[PDB]
Coordinates of C-alpha atoms and ligand atoms in Angstrom, one line a residue:
Chain A
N18 CA 0.0 0.0 0.0
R19 CA 2.0 2.9 -1.4
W20 CA 1.0 6.5 -2.2
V21 CA 1.0 7.1 -5.9
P22 CA 1.4 10.5 -7.7
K23 CA -0.4 10.6 -11.2
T24 CA -18.2 23.0 -18.7
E25 CA -16.6 20.8 -16.0
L26 CA -17.7 18.3 -13.4
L27 CA -16.0 16.8 -10.3
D28 CA -16.7 13.6 -8.4
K29 CA -16.3 13.5 -4.6
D30 CA -12.6 12.7 -4.6
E31 CA -11.7 15.2 -7.3
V32 CA -13.6 17.8 -5.2
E33 CA -11.8 16.8 -1.9
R34 CA -8.4 17.0 -3.6
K35 CA -8.8 20.3 -5.3
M36 CA -10.2 21.6 -2.0
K37 CA -7.3 20.3 0.1
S38 CA -5.0 22.0 -2.4
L39 CA -7.0 25.2 -2.4
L40 CA -7.3 25.3 1.4
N41 CA -3.6 24.6 1.9
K42 CA -2.8 27.6 -0.3
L43 CA -5.1 30.0 1.3
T44 CA -3.0 33.0 2.6
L45 CA -3.7 36.6 3.0
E46 CA -1.5 37.4 0.0
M47 CA -3.1 34.9 -2.3
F48 CA -6.6 35.3 -1.0
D49 CA -8.7 36.8 -3.8
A50 CA -7.1 34.4 -6.3
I51 CA -7.7 31.4 -4.2
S52 CA -11.1 32.2 -2.7
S53 CA -12.1 32.8 -6.3
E54 CA -11.0 29.3 -7.2
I55 CA -12.8 27.8 -4.2
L56 CA -16.0 29.6 -5.4
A57 CA -15.8 28.1 -8.9
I58 CA -15.8 24.7 -7.2
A59 CA -18.7 25.7 -5.1
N60 CA -20.5 27.1 -8.1
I61 CA -20.4 23.7 -9.8
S62 CA -23.8 23.2 -8.0
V63 CA -25.7 24.9 -10.8
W64 CA -25.6 21.6 -12.5
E65 CA -26.9 19.7 -9.5
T66 CA -30.2 19.1 -7.8
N67 CA -29.4 18.7 -4.1
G68 CA -26.4 21.1 -3.8
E69 CA -24.2 18.2 -3.0
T70 CA -20.8 19.7 -4.1
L71 CA -21.4 23.1 -2.3
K72 CA -22.5 21.2 0.8
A73 CA -19.2 19.4 0.4
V74 CA -17.1 22.6 0.1
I75 CA -18.7 24.2 3.2
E76 CA -18.0 21.0 5.1
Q77 CA -14.4 21.0 4.1
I78 CA -13.9 24.7 5.0
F79 CA -15.1 23.8 8.5
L80 CA -12.8 20.9 8.8
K81 CA -9.9 23.1 7.8
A82 CA -11.0 26.0 10.0
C83 CA -11.3 23.7 13.1
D84 CA -7.8 22.3 12.7
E85 CA -6.0 25.5 11.7
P86 CA -7.4 28.0 14.4
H87 CA -4.6 30.5 13.6
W88 CA -6.4 31.1 10.3
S89 CA -10.1 30.7 11.5
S90 CA -10.8 34.3 10.6
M91 CA -9.4 34.1 7.1
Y92 CA -11.5 30.9 6.5
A93 CA -14.4 32.8 8.0
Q94 CA -13.8 35.4 5.3
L95 CA -13.7 32.7 2.6
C96 CA -17.2 31.8 3.7
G97 CA -18.4 35.4 3.5
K98 CA -17.0 35.4 -0.1
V99 CA -19.0 32.3 -1.0
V100 CA -22.2 33.7 0.5
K101 CA -21.8 37.0 -1.3
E102 CA -20.6 35.7 -4.7
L103 CA -22.4 32.4 -5.1
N104 CA -24.2 32.1 -8.3
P105 CA -27.9 33.0 -7.6
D106 CA -29.2 30.5 -10.2
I107 CA -28.3 27.7 -7.8
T108 CA -31.1 25.5 -6.3
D109 CA -31.2 22.7 -3.7
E110 CA -34.3 20.6 -3.5
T111 CA -33.9 20.2 0.3
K112 CA -33.6 29.4 -0.6
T113 CA -31.1 30.4 -3.2
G114 CA -27.9 32.3 -3.7
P115 CA -26.7 33.9 -0.4
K116 CA -29.7 32.8 1.8
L117 CA -28.9 29.2 0.7
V118 CA -25.2 29.3 1.7
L119 CA -26.2 31.1 5.0
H120 CA -28.4 28.2 5.8
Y121 CA -25.7 25.8 4.8
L122 CA -23.2 27.4 7.3
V123 CA -25.7 27.1 10.2
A124 CA -26.6 23.5 9.4
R125 CA -22.9 22.6 9.3
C126 CA -22.1 24.2 12.7
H127 CA -25.0 22.2 14.2
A128 CA -23.6 19.0 12.7
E129 CA -20.1 19.6 13.8
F130 CA -21.3 21.0 17.2
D131 CA -23.6 18.0 18.0
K132 CA -20.6 15.6 17.7
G133 CA -19.4 17.2 20.9
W134 CA -16.3 16.7 23.0
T135 CA -15.0 16.5 26.6
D136 CA -13.1 19.2 28.5
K137 CA -11.3 17.0 31.0
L138 CA -8.6 14.8 29.4
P139 CA -7.1 11.6 30.9
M140 CA 0.9 10.4 25.0
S141 CA -1.4 7.4 25.1
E142 CA -3.5 5.1 22.9
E143 CA -7.0 6.6 22.1
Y144 CA -5.6 9.6 24.1
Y145 CA -4.4 11.4 20.9
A146 CA -7.9 11.0 19.4
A147 CA -9.5 12.8 22.3
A148 CA -6.9 15.7 22.6
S149 CA -7.8 16.2 18.9
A150 CA -11.5 16.0 19.8
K151 CA -11.2 18.9 22.2
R152 CA -8.8 20.8 20.1
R153 CA -11.1 20.6 17.1
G154 CA -14.2 21.4 19.1
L155 CA -12.6 24.5 20.6
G156 CA -11.3 25.4 17.1
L157 CA -14.9 25.3 16.1
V158 CA -16.3 27.6 18.8
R159 CA -13.5 29.9 17.7
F160 CA -14.7 29.6 14.1
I161 CA -18.3 30.2 15.1
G162 CA -17.1 33.4 16.7
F163 CA -15.5 34.6 13.4
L164 CA -18.6 33.7 11.4
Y165 CA -21.0 35.4 13.9
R166 CA -18.8 38.5 13.7
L167 CA -19.3 38.8 9.9
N168 CA -23.0 38.2 10.4
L169 CA -22.8 34.8 8.7
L170 CA -24.6 33.3 11.7
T171 CA -27.4 34.3 14.0
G172 CA -27.3 34.6 17.8
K173 CA -29.1 31.3 18.3
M174 CA -25.8 29.4 17.5
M175 CA -23.8 31.8 19.6
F176 CA -26.1 31.1 22.6
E177 CA -25.6 27.4 22.1
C178 CA -21.9 28.1 22.0
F179 CA -21.7 30.1 25.2
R180 CA -24.2 27.6 26.6
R181 CA -21.7 24.7 26.0
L182 CA -18.7 26.7 27.4
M183 CA -20.5 27.8 30.5
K184 CA -21.2 24.1 31.2
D185 CA -17.5 23.4 31.3
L186 CA -16.8 26.6 33.2
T187 CA -18.7 25.3 36.2
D188 CA -17.2 21.8 36.3
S189 CA -13.5 22.6 37.0
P190 CA -12.5 24.3 33.7
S191 CA -9.2 23.5 31.9
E192 CA -6.9 26.3 30.8
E193 CA -7.6 25.7 27.1
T194 CA -11.3 26.2 27.7
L195 CA -10.8 29.4 29.6
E196 CA -8.4 30.6 26.9
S197 CA -11.2 29.8 24.4
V198 CA -13.9 31.8 26.3
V199 CA -11.7 34.9 26.7
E200 CA -10.8 34.9 23.0
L201 CA -14.4 34.5 22.1
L202 CA -15.6 37.3 24.4
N203 CA -12.8 39.5 22.9
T204 CA -13.9 38.7 19.4
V205 CA -17.7 38.7 19.8
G206 CA -18.5 39.9 23.3
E207 CA -19.5 43.5 22.4
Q208 CA -21.7 42.5 19.4
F209 CA -23.3 39.7 21.4
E210 CA -24.3 42.2 24.1
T211 CA -27.4 43.0 22.1
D212 CA -28.9 39.9 20.5
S213 CA -32.0 37.8 21.2
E214 CA -31.6 37.8 26.4
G215 CA -28.0 38.4 25.3
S216 CA -26.7 40.8 27.9
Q217 CA -28.3 38.5 30.4
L218 CA -26.3 35.5 29.3
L219 CA -23.1 37.5 29.6
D220 CA -24.2 38.4 33.1
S221 CA -24.4 34.7 34.1
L222 CA -21.1 33.9 32.3
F223 CA -19.1 36.7 34.0
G224 CA -20.5 35.6 37.3
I225 CA -19.0 32.1 36.6
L226 CA -15.7 33.8 35.8
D227 CA -15.6 36.0 38.9
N228 CA -16.1 32.8 40.8
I229 CA -13.3 31.1 38.9
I230 CA -11.0 34.0 39.6
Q231 CA -12.0 34.2 43.3
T232 CA -11.7 30.5 44.0
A233 CA -10.2 28.2 41.4
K234 CA -6.4 27.7 41.3
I235 CA -5.3 28.9 37.8
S236 CA -2.0 30.2 36.3
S237 CA -1.4 33.9 36.8
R238 CA -1.4 34.3 33.1
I239 CA -5.1 33.1 32.8
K240 CA -6.1 35.0 35.9
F241 CA -4.8 38.1 34.2
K242 CA -6.9 37.4 31.1
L243 CA -10.1 36.9 33.1
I244 CA -9.6 40.1 35.1
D245 CA -9.1 42.0 31.9
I246 CA -12.3 41.0 30.0
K247 CA -14.1 41.6 33.3
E248 CA -12.9 45.2 33.4
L249 CA -13.3 45.5 29.6
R250 CA -17.0 44.6 29.7
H251 CA -17.9 46.1 33.1
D252 CA -15.7 49.2 33.5
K253 CA -14.5 50.2 30.1
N254 CA -17.7 49.0 28.3
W255 CA -15.7 47.5 25.4
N256 CA -14.3 51.0 24.6
Chain B
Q103 CA 33.5 25.3 29.3
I104 CA 32.5 26.3 32.8
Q105 CA 30.9 24.1 35.5
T106 CA 27.6 24.7 37.2
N107 CA 27.6 25.4 41.0
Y108 CA 24.0 26.5 41.7
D109 CA 21.2 23.9 42.2
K110 CA 17.9 25.7 42.1
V111 CA 15.4 25.6 39.3
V112 CA 12.1 27.5 39.1
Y113 CA 9.8 26.3 36.5
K114 CA 7.0 28.8 36.4
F115 CA 7.1 32.6 36.2
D116 CA 4.4 32.5 38.9
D117 CA 7.0 31.0 41.3
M118 CA 9.5 33.9 40.8
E119 CA 7.9 36.4 43.1
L120 CA 7.8 39.0 40.3
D121 CA 5.9 42.2 40.4
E122 CA 2.5 42.0 38.8
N123 CA 3.2 44.9 36.4
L124 CA 6.3 42.9 35.3
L125 CA 4.5 39.6 35.2
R126 CA 1.8 41.1 32.9
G127 CA 4.7 42.4 30.8
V128 CA 6.3 38.9 30.4
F129 CA 3.0 37.2 29.5
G130 CA 1.7 39.9 27.2
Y131 CA 5.0 39.6 25.3
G132 CA 4.8 35.9 24.5
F133 CA 6.7 34.2 27.3
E134 CA 4.6 31.7 29.2
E135 CA 7.1 29.3 30.7
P136 CA 10.7 30.2 31.4
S137 CA 13.3 28.5 29.2
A138 CA 16.3 26.6 30.6
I139 CA 18.5 29.6 31.6
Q140 CA 15.5 31.6 32.8
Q141 CA 14.5 28.8 35.1
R142 CA 18.0 28.7 36.6
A143 CA 19.3 32.3 36.4
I144 CA 16.5 34.8 36.9
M145 CA 16.3 34.1 40.7
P146 CA 20.0 34.3 41.5
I147 CA 20.2 37.6 39.7
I148 CA 17.3 39.0 41.6
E149 CA 18.7 37.7 44.9
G150 CA 21.9 39.7 44.4
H151 CA 24.5 37.2 43.2
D152 CA 27.0 37.7 40.5
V153 CA 25.9 35.3 37.7
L154 CA 28.2 33.8 35.1
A155 CA 26.1 32.3 32.3
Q156 CA 27.5 30.3 29.5
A157 CA 24.6 30.1 27.0
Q158 CA 24.1 30.2 23.3
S159 CA 21.9 32.7 21.6
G160 CA 18.2 31.9 21.3
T161 CA 18.0 30.3 24.7
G162 CA 16.2 33.2 26.4
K163 CA 19.3 35.2 27.5
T164 CA 18.0 38.7 27.0
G165 CA 14.8 37.7 28.8
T166 CA 16.7 36.3 31.8
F167 CA 18.5 39.6 32.6
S168 CA 15.8 42.0 31.4
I169 CA 13.3 40.4 33.8
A170 CA 15.8 40.2 36.8
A171 CA 16.7 43.8 36.2
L172 CA 13.2 45.3 36.0
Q173 CA 12.2 43.5 39.2
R174 CA 15.2 45.0 40.9
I175 CA 14.5 48.6 39.7
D176 CA 13.3 51.2 42.2
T177 CA 10.7 53.3 40.4
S178 CA 11.2 55.9 43.2
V179 CA 14.8 56.5 42.0
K180 CA 14.9 58.3 38.7
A181 CA 18.5 57.5 37.8
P182 CA 20.5 54.7 36.0
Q183 CA 20.2 51.6 38.3
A184 CA 21.3 49.0 35.8
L185 CA 23.6 49.1 32.8
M186 CA 23.3 46.6 30.0
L187 CA 26.2 46.3 27.6
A188 CA 26.3 44.6 24.1
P189 CA 28.9 44.4 21.3
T190 CA 26.8 46.1 18.6
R191 CA 24.2 48.8 18.4
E192 CA 21.9 46.3 16.6
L193 CA 22.2 44.0 19.6
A194 CA 21.7 46.9 22.1
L195 CA 18.6 48.1 20.2
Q196 CA 17.2 44.6 20.4
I197 CA 17.8 44.4 24.1
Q198 CA 16.1 47.8 24.5
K199 CA 13.1 46.7 22.5
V200 CA 12.7 43.7 24.8
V201 CA 13.4 45.6 28.1
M202 CA 10.8 48.2 27.1
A203 CA 8.2 45.5 26.1
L204 CA 8.5 43.6 29.4
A205 CA 8.2 47.0 31.1
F206 CA 5.0 48.2 29.4
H207 CA 3.0 48.2 32.7
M208 CA 5.7 49.8 34.9
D209 CA 7.1 53.3 35.1
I210 CA 10.7 52.6 33.9
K211 CA 12.6 54.6 31.4
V212 CA 15.2 52.8 29.3
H213 CA 17.8 54.7 27.4
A214 CA 20.1 53.5 24.6
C215 CA 23.8 54.7 24.4
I216 CA 25.3 54.4 20.9
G217 CA 18.6 62.9 28.4
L218 CA 20.2 59.8 30.0
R219 CA 20.8 61.1 33.5
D220 CA 17.1 60.2 34.2
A221 CA 16.9 56.8 32.5
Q222 CA 16.5 53.9 35.0
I223 CA 18.0 51.2 32.8
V224 CA 20.8 52.0 30.3
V225 CA 21.7 50.0 27.3
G226 CA 24.6 50.5 25.0
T227 CA 27.9 49.5 23.5
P228 CA 31.1 49.7 25.6
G229 CA 32.8 52.6 23.8
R230 CA 29.8 54.9 23.6
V231 CA 29.0 54.1 27.2
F232 CA 32.5 54.7 28.4
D233 CA 32.7 58.1 26.5
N234 CA 29.4 59.1 28.1
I235 CA 30.5 58.3 31.7
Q236 CA 33.7 60.2 31.1
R237 CA 31.8 63.3 29.8
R238 CA 29.7 63.1 33.0
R239 CA 26.7 62.6 30.7
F240 CA 25.2 59.9 32.8
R241 CA 24.9 59.5 36.6
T242 CA 26.6 56.2 37.6
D243 CA 26.3 56.5 41.4
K244 CA 22.9 54.7 41.5
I245 CA 24.1 51.9 39.3
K246 CA 23.4 48.6 41.2
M247 CA 23.7 46.1 38.3
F248 CA 26.1 45.6 35.4
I249 CA 25.1 43.2 32.7
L250 CA 27.6 42.2 30.0
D251 CA 25.9 40.3 27.2
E252 CA 28.1 38.3 24.9
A253 CA 31.3 39.1 26.7
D254 CA 33.3 37.0 24.2
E255 CA 32.1 39.1 21.2
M256 CA 32.8 42.3 23.2
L257 CA 36.4 41.3 23.9
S258 CA 36.8 40.1 20.4
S259 CA 35.6 43.5 19.0
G260 CA 38.3 45.5 20.8
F261 CA 36.4 46.5 23.9
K262 CA 38.6 45.2 26.7
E263 CA 39.9 48.6 28.0
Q264 CA 36.5 50.3 27.8
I265 CA 35.0 47.5 29.8
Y266 CA 37.9 47.4 32.4
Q267 CA 37.4 51.2 32.8
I268 CA 33.6 50.9 33.2
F269 CA 34.1 48.3 35.9
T270 CA 36.2 50.8 37.9
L271 CA 33.8 53.7 37.3
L272 CA 30.8 52.1 38.9
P273 CA 30.0 51.7 42.6
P274 CA 32.4 49.1 44.0
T275 CA 29.3 47.0 45.1
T276 CA 27.7 46.9 41.7
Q277 CA 26.4 43.3 41.0
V278 CA 27.9 41.7 37.9
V279 CA 26.0 39.4 35.4
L280 CA 28.2 38.1 32.5
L281 CA 26.8 36.0 29.7
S282 CA 28.9 34.4 27.0
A283 CA 28.5 31.6 24.5
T284 CA 32.2 30.8 24.8
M285 CA 34.4 31.1 27.9
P286 CA 37.9 31.6 26.6
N287 CA 40.9 32.8 28.8
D288 CA 40.1 36.5 28.0
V289 CA 36.6 36.2 29.3
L290 CA 37.6 34.2 32.3
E291 CA 40.1 37.0 33.1
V292 CA 37.2 39.5 33.4
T293 CA 35.5 36.9 35.6
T294 CA 38.3 36.1 38.1
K295 CA 39.0 39.8 38.4
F296 CA 35.6 41.5 38.4
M297 CA 33.2 39.0 39.8
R298 CA 32.7 37.8 43.4
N299 CA 31.9 34.1 44.0
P300 CA 29.6 34.0 40.9
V301 CA 26.7 31.6 40.5
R302 CA 28.1 29.6 37.5
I303 CA 25.4 28.3 35.1
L304 CA 26.1 26.3 32.0
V305 CA 23.2 25.6 29.5
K306 CA 24.3 23.1 26.8
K307 CA 22.2 23.0 23.6
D308 CA 20.0 19.9 23.4
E309 CA 21.1 17.3 21.0
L310 CA 18.8 16.6 18.0
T311 CA 17.0 13.3 17.6
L312 CA 15.0 11.6 14.9
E313 CA 12.8 9.7 17.3
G314 CA 10.3 12.5 17.4
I315 CA 9.5 12.5 13.7
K316 CA 8.0 10.0 11.3
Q317 CA 10.1 9.9 8.1
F318 CA 8.9 8.7 4.6
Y319 CA 10.2 8.7 1.1
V320 CA 8.8 9.0 -2.4
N321 CA 10.5 7.4 -5.4
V322 CA 10.1 10.1 -8.0
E323 CA 12.4 8.0 -10.2
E324 CA 13.6 11.0 -12.2
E325 CA 14.4 14.6 -11.4
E326 CA 12.0 16.0 -13.9
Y327 CA 9.2 14.4 -11.8
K328 CA 10.0 16.0 -8.4
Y329 CA 7.8 19.1 -8.9
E330 CA 4.7 17.0 -10.1
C331 CA 5.0 14.9 -6.9
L332 CA 5.0 18.0 -4.7
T333 CA 1.9 19.5 -6.2
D334 CA 0.1 16.1 -5.8
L335 CA 1.2 15.9 -2.2
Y336 CA -0.8 19.1 -1.7
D337 CA -3.9 17.4 -3.2
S338 CA -3.5 14.5 -0.8
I339 CA -2.7 15.8 2.6
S340 CA -3.7 18.8 4.7
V341 CA -0.8 21.2 5.5
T342 CA -0.5 24.1 7.9
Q343 CA 3.0 25.2 6.9
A344 CA 6.0 23.3 5.5
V345 CA 9.7 23.7 5.1
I346 CA 11.3 22.5 1.8
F347 CA 15.1 21.9 1.6
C348 CA 17.1 22.0 -1.7
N349 CA 20.9 21.7 -2.0
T350 CA 21.6 24.7 -4.2
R351 CA 20.5 28.3 -4.2
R352 CA 19.5 28.0 -7.8
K353 CA 17.0 25.2 -7.1
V354 CA 15.6 27.0 -4.1
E355 CA 14.9 30.0 -6.3
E356 CA 13.6 28.0 -9.3
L357 CA 11.3 26.0 -7.0
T358 CA 10.2 29.2 -5.2
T359 CA 8.9 30.9 -8.4
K360 CA 7.5 27.6 -9.8
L361 CA 5.3 27.3 -6.7
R362 CA 4.2 31.0 -6.8
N363 CA 2.9 30.4 -10.4
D364 CA 0.7 27.7 -8.9
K365 CA -0.5 30.3 -6.4
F366 CA 1.5 29.1 -3.4
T367 CA 2.7 31.8 -1.0
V368 CA 6.4 30.9 -0.4
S369 CA 9.5 32.2 1.4
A370 CA 13.1 31.4 0.3
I371 CA 16.4 31.5 2.2
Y372 CA 19.9 30.7 1.1
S373 CA 23.4 31.7 2.2
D374 CA 24.2 34.9 0.3
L375 CA 21.4 36.8 2.1
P376 CA 22.2 39.2 4.9
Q377 CA 21.7 37.6 8.3
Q378 CA 19.1 40.3 8.9
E379 CA 17.3 39.4 5.8
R380 CA 17.0 35.7 6.7
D381 CA 15.9 36.7 10.2
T382 CA 13.0 38.7 8.8
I383 CA 12.0 35.9 6.4
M384 CA 11.9 33.3 9.1
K385 CA 10.0 35.6 11.6
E386 CA 7.3 36.5 9.0
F387 CA 6.9 32.9 8.0
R388 CA 6.7 31.7 11.6
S389 CA 3.9 34.3 12.0
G390 CA 1.8 32.9 9.2
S391 CA 2.4 35.3 6.3
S392 CA 3.6 32.6 3.9
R393 CA 2.8 28.9 4.2
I394 CA 5.9 27.4 2.6
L395 CA 9.5 28.1 3.4
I396 CA 12.2 26.9 1.0
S397 CA 15.8 26.8 2.2
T398 CA 19.3 25.6 1.3
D399 CA 21.4 23.5 3.6
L400 CA 24.4 25.7 4.5
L401 CA 21.8 27.3 6.9
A402 CA 20.0 24.2 8.0
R403 CA 22.1 25.0 11.1
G404 CA 20.8 28.4 12.2
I405 CA 17.3 27.4 11.3
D406 CA 14.5 27.0 13.9
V407 CA 12.4 23.9 13.5
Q408 CA 9.3 25.2 15.2
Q409 CA 5.9 23.4 15.3
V410 CA 6.2 23.0 11.5
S411 CA 4.5 19.6 11.0
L412 CA 5.9 18.9 7.6
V413 CA 9.4 18.9 6.2
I414 CA 10.2 17.9 2.6
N415 CA 13.7 17.1 1.4
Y416 CA 13.1 18.0 -2.2
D417 CA 16.8 17.4 -2.8
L418 CA 18.6 14.7 -0.9
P419 CA 21.5 16.1 1.3
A420 CA 24.8 15.8 -0.5
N421 CA 26.4 15.7 2.9
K422 CA 25.1 12.9 5.1
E423 CA 25.7 15.1 8.2
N424 CA 22.9 17.6 7.4
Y425 CA 19.9 15.3 7.4
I426 CA 19.7 15.6 11.2
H427 CA 19.9 19.4 10.9
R428 CA 17.0 19.5 8.5
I429 CA 14.6 17.1 10.3
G430 CA 15.7 16.8 14.0
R431 CA 13.9 17.4 17.3
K432 CA 7.1 15.2 16.5
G433 CA 6.2 15.8 12.9
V434 CA 6.8 14.4 9.4
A435 CA 9.8 14.2 7.1
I436 CA 9.2 13.2 3.4
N437 CA 12.2 12.7 1.1
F438 CA 12.3 12.9 -2.7
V439 CA 14.5 10.1 -4.1
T440 CA 15.3 9.5 -7.7
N441 CA 16.9 6.3 -9.2
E442 CA 20.4 7.7 -8.5
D443 CA 19.4 8.9 -5.0
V444 CA 18.7 5.3 -3.9
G445 CA 22.3 4.5 -2.9
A446 CA 22.4 7.9 -1.3
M447 CA 19.3 7.2 0.7
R448 CA 20.9 3.9 1.9
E449 CA 23.7 6.0 3.4
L450 CA 21.1 8.0 5.5
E451 CA 19.5 4.6 6.2
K452 CA 22.6 3.3 8.0
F453 CA 24.2 6.6 9.2
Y454 CA 21.4 7.1 11.7
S455 CA 20.4 3.5 11.9
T456 CA 16.9 4.9 11.2
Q457 CA 13.9 3.6 9.2
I458 CA 12.2 5.5 6.4
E459 CA 9.2 3.7 5.1
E460 CA 7.7 4.5 1.7
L461 CA 4.9 7.0 1.7
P462 CA 1.6 5.1 2.4
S463 CA -1.6 6.0 0.5
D464 CA -2.9 6.4 4.0
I465 CA -1.4 9.6 5.2
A466 CA -4.2 12.3 5.1
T467 CA -4.9 10.6 8.4
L468 CA -1.4 10.3 9.9
Ligands
AMP21 N1 10.2 32.3 28.1 C1 10.3 32.3 26.7 N2 9.3 31.7 26.0 C2 9.3 31.6 24.7 N3 10.2 32.2 24.0 C3 11.3 32.9 24.5 C4 11.3 33.0 26.0 N4 12.4 33.7 26.3 C5 13.0 34.0 25.1 N5 12.3 33.5 24.0 C6 12.7 33.7 22.6 O1 14.1 33.4 22.4 C7 14.6 34.1 21.3 C8 16.1 34.5 21.4 O2 16.3 34.8 22.8 P1 17.7 35.3 23.4 O3 18.5 34.1 23.8 O4 17.3 36.2 24.5 O5 18.5 36.0 22.2 C9 13.7 35.3 21.1 O6 13.1 35.2 19.8 C10 12.5 35.1 22.1 O7 11.3 35.3 21.5

């Protein structure tokens, strides 16, 4: 078993390969060129009935975004490009143009979200698979935060997100999770303030964090991060 | 080569009784956990001891003495309380950038010497700093700490007398910290004469291993086929960033522009570049601007194998010795071998007594 080298339609494989190649090449410099090519692959769906190739492209952007958090926001832009510039003639038997892709984004966070993950972790056997489970889950919450910020997602998915994080925040939170919450609140906290409910959810959340600061035993570094969003939201008012 | 005589390691910055304003500085700069030297030498310096550190560059030297010094500063006293010395203005400008960055949340002025009677930390080169003391341009009576970075380079750039002078112009109880990659007779002379019972710390660079990384090969058979295999590699597996090594500068550059035509974002380094130019290329790549770095071998030595998952030996190392320097520590090494490269790849096979299985169709997973 050895790896072997070597008006248009593409089978699953041909669409996963071109997409790997296009997602690996995505940089700030080469963005317009490469988000244009990823959109021609998405656009193939004019010649389809159930939007299968475009569903497939969204799903791959999420898989990429979730494993390459450092670029979550650039991938989040790629999506905004697909929503904005998708061919409107496109139809899916199961909403067209932008409103179609928008619904695709949501449906795919729900899918990836529902899989779930655990905060507390046990180099070991299935232990690698579960560090990647958390890493990828947290990479997703992060990616949600960048989609929400471009208004490519509604608050309902941001509630479900904070809802999940708050759950782990009350059961002895790991430092990666706390890291995740801060970064999310820094990205999306102001905007979320007003969304239906939403200021009231932050109220609960910041009360869990005040507790964590005033009781839990955490690195100074993280304790400094928590004290800083707390002052940013409460005293400085995000300004 | 000097021997250690201090047995106290502190692993976390939290355990170093630093001032909050300074702790915020260190974290908000990128440091999270102290490197080797920093674990061992921050605390002795803070506690008042003369510290003699033999450490290579890129070990966290500047951060060791910058943190110790800030902690020791008295914000009440608005005068030079520490002097940092370096061989070059480039190097003293670096040290200043760092000292300032760690100091963001404290009220401490840092002046560079290449309006300094009110700086609390002073940084410069030995000549300019001598001239300025002599011209009574900066108050030295509050100086409590004298840090000589890269003492070997300072002595080897004709700074012996300036330094000897400086030693004698500072308060006779000034604490001395001397850092040097090498400890030749000349530098030990400064040590025996100007230091008192120093804490001696030796940090030896960690030996590279192959155990960490999984290595593979791809028989491209012929040279004309190498490129086509690289592009298909990028259809097959998911990459964050990669390093690619070629033997010559010519191929580095030819490969670089071939990849840009295929819309890759790539960085190239080779020997003839200014050390400053390479430094920028590497820094900008390690920060995510480009996603591929192509490099020759002559500088597989100064290179920093960060969390880069994937390393591709597009050319096979003409010198057996540099295969460790290209792919040494977890990650992945993939070598391109042609028909003539096979006997060469048997050399590597047995030189490291290492195993390099052929690239499996199942990798997108691994
Ligand atoms: N505690 C630390 N954590 C991570 N990186 C560090 C730390 N201290 C120093 N460095 C890095 O080490 C490099 C060279 O350090 P130096 O040995 O001070 O010249 C710099 O690029 C720093 O970013």
